[PDB]
Design a protein around this ligand. Structure first.
Ligand SMILES: Nc1ncnc2c1ncn2[C@@H]1O[C@H](COP(=O)(O)OP(=O)(O)O)[C@@H](O)[C@H]1O
Ligand SMILES: [Mg+2]
Lengths: 145, 145, 242
């Protein structure tokens, strides 16, 4: 096509700078390009990232990156609906364990990146009662399969 | 005599190969239908059977049985790759219905016994009449079947 | 201008899909079924297709906590608007997300199969609907105060003025289990399958979103739009290899 582009492009450099690859390396990540690519995707992701981690290699990295206010809530836990709602309001990050396949209908509105803005505040409808949504909320879905 | 003669002597009627049923009809069940068909055919033509002579009555009662018998095992016949092939096989074996015969180039179903005529006159269908019914499912065309 | 604003590409293949949905709605009594993968635009193509024709679309709203009796009351409200003689034919919109459980489908199939679900309203309420249709029957010149052909005529009108639109995804054997379980759905409704968007259509999608963005010679735009189609196609070929 002949579109203006640099002579030597690699996806790793665009997604993330060299310095932040050196940060990740310290937070229990290997130096192989495949894992850096993967780590670079989740940073630039416009959607919620569903991660597949046999040997929990991804999960260890996620725990390293999110040093502060990281909460891991499995699907099996009975107060997971109540915990997520309280997390959405004021949570740095959220991690969901298990959720191998057949994702619960309560998460389907959350999974949707479209949010409803009521004046100044932003409102996201999960379960019976709508919960107040805050910016810089992150959601990570890990599945061992 | 007719009941006894058509079930015991004919191996072809009870033969799985010759007659292909949709559902596995029991012997007793097919007899119950013959009886209920024969019933209604006697009530309609009771006054005609008394007016007629015993010789043409003896033909007429056999005919009534064949027609009733045909239909009592006719309905159950179907399934397979082609329904037409299973009918033609059943048409062939039943075509030998003792003294009474069916006209050639017609199915046993298509012919019904007329008491006044005695000619096994084929089923007459009423030429469809156009109707102003908006729904297509409401519009009913008559067929030989 | 009037309804909620919906953006769409309006490519050749999408437009063809609008045409053959408009066609199924134009046929009286016949119901439309749309089958396609998640995001095929079918729900938004239906709402548009409905509006193109002179029909009023009513979709049920499902809350997190919903009950069979709550559904019946939403349907019941729709049938009051159809019952009146001088009424525009109501379209009914359903998606896989709207069907939270399989119990909610049972009423809808008995509606869509023929007439209206058995014992939706009381007998005394039905009698008051029948009387309103009697005024129309006089104008039509159909037999009145027969209480057999009139009741029948009411079922014909209700059938003509109710259209049922279903939307499923053929991704699991769950939809196939719906077909097996629910006989009315597959035979009564007119199936419509959405194929993936052609390479030529994908070019037009990109060409629409790149508009109102600055470029050096706007030849980049026309080329990028090709590459956007080529990249999505090359994933499906790689996905087949995978
Ligand atoms: N042709 C299109 N052009 C632009 N956006 C589209 C198009 N088709 C679908 N979309 C967008 O994607 C969404 C797909 O959801 P929907 O229309 O309900 O289809 P589905 O039932 O297949 O998910 C639309 O609501 C709209 O936001
Ligand atoms: Mg959708």
């Amino acid at each position: 096509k002949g579109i203006p582009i640099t002579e030597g492009i690699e996806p790793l450099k665009i997604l993330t700078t060299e310095a932040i690859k050196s940060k990740w390396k310290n937070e229990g990540l290997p130096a192989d390009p495949m894992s850096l690519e993967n780590a670079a995707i989740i940073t630039a992701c416009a959607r919620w990232p569903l991660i597949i981690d046999p040997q929990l290699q991804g999960s260890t990295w996620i725990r390293g990156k999110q040093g502060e206010n990281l909460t891991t809530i499995s699907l099996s836990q009975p107060k997971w609906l109540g915990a997520l709602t309280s997390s959405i309001s004021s949570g740095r990050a959220v991690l969901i364990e298990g959720i191998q396949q057949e994702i619960d209908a309560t998460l389907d509105p959350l999974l949707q990146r479209a949010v409803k803005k009521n004046g100044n505040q932003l409102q996201l409808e999960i379960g019976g009662d709508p919960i107040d949504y805050d910016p810089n909320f992150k959601l990570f879905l890990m599945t061992k399969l | 005599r007719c009941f006894q003669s058509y079930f015991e002597q004919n191996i072809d009627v009870h033969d799985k190969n010759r007659v292909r049923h949709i559902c596995p009809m029991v012997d007793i069940a097919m007899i119950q239908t013959i009886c209920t068909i024969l019933d209604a055919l006697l009530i309609q033509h009771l006054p005609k059977l008394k007016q007629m002579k015993e010789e043409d009555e003896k033909q007429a009662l056999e005919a009534f049985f064949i027609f009733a018998g045909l239909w009592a095992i006719g309905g159950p016949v179907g399934g397979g790759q082609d329904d037409s092939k299973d009918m033609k096989e059943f048409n062939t074996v039943w075509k030998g219905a003792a003294k009474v015969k069916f006209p050639e180039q017609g199915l046993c179903y298509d012919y019904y016994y007329d008491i006044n005529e005695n000619k096994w006159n084929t089923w007459k269908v009423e030429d469809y009449l156009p109707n102003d019914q908006p729904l297509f499912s409401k519009i009913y065309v008559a067929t030989i079947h | 201008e009037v309804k909620a604003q919906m953006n769409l590409v309006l490519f050749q293949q999408a437009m063809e899909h609008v045409s053959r949905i408009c066609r199924i709605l134009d046929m009286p009594g016949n119901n439309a079924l749309l089958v396609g993968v998640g995001g095929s635009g079918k729900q938004s193509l239906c709402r548009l297709s409905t509006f193109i024709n002179g029909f009023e679309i009513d979709q049920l709203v499902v809350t997190a906590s919903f009950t069979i009796n709550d559904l019946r009351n939403n349907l019941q409200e729709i049938y009051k608007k159809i019952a009146k003689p001088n009424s525009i034919a109501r379209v009914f919109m359903i998606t896989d997300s709207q069907i939270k459980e399989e119990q909610f489908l049972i009423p809808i199939n008995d509606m869509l199969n023929s007439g209206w679900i058995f014992d939706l309203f009381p007998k005394e309420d039905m009698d008051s609907l029948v009387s309103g249709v009697r005024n129309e029957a006089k104008g039509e010149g159909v037999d009145v105060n027969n209480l057999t052909a009139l009741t029948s005529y009411f079922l014909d009108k209700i059938r003509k003025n109710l259209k049922v639109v279903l939307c499923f995804s053929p991704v699991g054997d769950t939809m196939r289990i719906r077909s097996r379980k629910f006989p009315g759905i597959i035979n009564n409704t007119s199936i419509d399958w959405f194929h993936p968007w052609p390479h030529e259509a994908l070019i037009d999608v990109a060409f629409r979103f790149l508009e109102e963005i600055e470029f050096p010679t706007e030849e980049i735009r026309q080329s990028i739009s090709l590459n956007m189609a080529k990249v999505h196609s090359s994933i499906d070929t790689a996905n087949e290899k995978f």
